[PDB]
Design a protein around this ligand. Structure first.
Ligand code: HEM
Ligand SMILES: CCCCc1ccc(N/C=N\O)c(C)c1
Length: 482
């Protein structure tokens, strides 16, 4: 009985280890594989030095039973991430208790169904009205920030940006009305923190990899408590909207619109979806999009404002660009976001050096041959290291240098299409990319018009992976009103 399970395990690792025989790599500890380096602070930068020692790719082991091929070169990236192979179950299985089998984790033709269902929810006609909402939520955040700034001390902006991103996500895509944040929404935010802290730690800690053992550890119990808290939040948001649509005034109003917001699509009002969702399939897409359409943009906004603080020259250039575009308008219009070409460049360079998602994974369903002759069989595990990809010395002159002009029209024409993929690429790219970009542009444009941002030399951020890219100590900045 149990004997089979242990043998199925030991065969898999000789399979994975032999398929990577073509690929030299760093030294393994006998028990931990590479885990003792990965768990060290700064390990993203350690992986970068590895990519210079080993071109294209190198193996990566958490504790001797699971072995990934870390990849970080554009042809290698493209060979795999253009194909739609499944997400790595060893990594993505951990998601299930929390966000379930929603879009992120699915892989079948069921994935294509949901992707087809949900993609019109991020069409630009659905997005145009969100610009006003981004502005309102940002205004609330900035009024808080104005009070903190005139106290003269630096403070962590990450959490305030998150509360704002969560509120705006819910007003846009989950039907929440103008009421704004409630103490129960903050409960949810805190729980996401615990979920991503713990699940990242689980990814890196091979002893927690087996389901049965993990749910008996304090770690796993803490995770399940947070999963309940996340589910109490999403059950509420679902019941709230179903009930709001029982009102005859609101229900007729939604039908009139050609374009439906994301939660209303899932609820299949108008019968148009033609695909019937289980109660749990819908709970999972809500869980999924409630993690995804806000934790990442919080990382992005916050690392950007840090990059503005580090580089006042570019900060001031962006401040001037957005000042002219707004002119005398009350608030930015959707049409205005395309004019923000220099803000966009700086934002792209921010995402090169501080990718909001630094690492994603796949398990191949078919073999793949790489531009240099090497190859892998089906069954093998891939680790796309977006962090080291964006820092690759054969692709990026002076990789550690912040230079927005790398994303001018001129210096972009030649560039390889898989060199810069912070929203991934291929069939499993980010469904929310244009949502994020428009949100982040409105938020940061308004931030720079109302404050000048300085770093704090005594508390510079330190990089911390937590599924999204966070900081060990927050993002502490000084703010000057204007
Ligand atoms: C949900 C969701 C997906 C899955 C879409 C699908 O599978 O069809 C998605 C994908 C990605 C990926 C790939 C994930 C992987 O390889 O495991 C990356 C790297 C990424 C990065 C960012 N996303 Fe995203 N994303 C989903 C949802 C959202 C939403 C939802 C409203 C927004 C907004 C958004 C934004 C960003 C983002 C912004 C800074 C980054 C980076 N994503 N997504
Ligand atoms: C398995 C480690 C990374 C998994 C992962 C994949 C996608 C997202 N987000 C995508 N858009 O928001 C996050 C936040 C994480």
């Amino acid at each position: 009985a149990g004997f089979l399970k242990l043998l199925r395990l030991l065969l898999r690792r000789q399979r994975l280890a032999r398929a990577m025989d073509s690929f030299p790599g760093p030294p393994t500890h006998w028990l931990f594989g590479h885990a003792l380096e990965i768990q060290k602070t700064g390990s993203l930068d350690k992986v970068v030095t590895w990519t210079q020692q080993f071109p294209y790719a190198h193996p990566l082991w958490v504790g001797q039973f699971i072995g990934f091929l870390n990849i970080y070169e554009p042809d290698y990236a493209k060979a795999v991430y253009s194909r739609g192979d499944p997400k790595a179950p060893d990594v993505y299985d951990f998601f299930l208790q929390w966000i379930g089998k929603g879009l992120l984790v699915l892989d079948g033709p069921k994935w294509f169904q949901h992707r087809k269902l949900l993609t019109p929810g991020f069409h630009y006609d659905v997005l145009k009205p969100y610009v006003a909402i981004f502005a309102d939520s940002t205004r609330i955040m900035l009024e808080k920030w104005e009070k903190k700034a005139c106290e003269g001390k630096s403070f962590d902006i990450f959490s305030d940006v998150g509360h704002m991103a969560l509120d705006t996500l819910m007003k846009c895509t989950f039907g929440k009305g103008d009421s704004g944040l409630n103490h129960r929404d903050s409960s949810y935010y805190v729980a996401v923190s615990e979920l991503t802290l713990l699940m990242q730690q689980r990814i890196d800690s091979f002893q927690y990899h087996n389901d049965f053992i993990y749910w008996l550890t304090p770690h796993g119990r803490r995770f399940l408590r947070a999963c309940r808290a996340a589910h109490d939040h999403t059950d509420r948001v679902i019941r709230q909207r179903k009930a709001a649509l029982q009102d005859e005034k609101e229900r007729e109003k939604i039908q009139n619109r050609r374009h439906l917001d994301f939660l209303d699509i899932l609820l299949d009002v108008r019968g148009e979806s033609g695909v019937q969702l289980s109660d749990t399939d819908l709970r999972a897409e809500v869980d999924t999009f409630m993690f995804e359409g806000h934790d990442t943009t919080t990382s992005g906004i916050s690392w950007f404002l840090y990059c503005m603080a580090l580089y006042p020259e570019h900060q001031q250039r962006c401040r001037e660009e957005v000042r002219e575009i707004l002119g005398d308008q009350d608030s930015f219009q959707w049409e205005d976001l395309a004019k923000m070409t220099y803000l966009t460049m700086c934002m792209k360079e921010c995402f090169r050096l501080y990718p909001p998602v630094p690492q994603v994974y796949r398990q191949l369903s078919k073999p793949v041959s790489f531009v240099d002759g090497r190859s892998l069989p089906a069954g093998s595990l891939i680790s796309l290291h977006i962090y080291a990809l964006h820092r690759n010395s054969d692709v990026w002159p002076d990789p550690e240098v912040f230079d927005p002009l790398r994303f001018s029209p001129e210096n972009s024409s030649g560039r390889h299409p898989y060199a810069f993929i912070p929203f991934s690429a291929g069939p499993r790219n980010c469904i929310g990319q244009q949502f994020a970009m428009n949100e982040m542009k409105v938020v940061t444009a308004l931030c720079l018009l109302r404050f000048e941002f300085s770093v704090d030399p005594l508390r510079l951020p330190i990089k911390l992976p937590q599924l999204v890219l966070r900081s060990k100590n927050g993002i502490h900045l000084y703010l000057k009103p204007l």
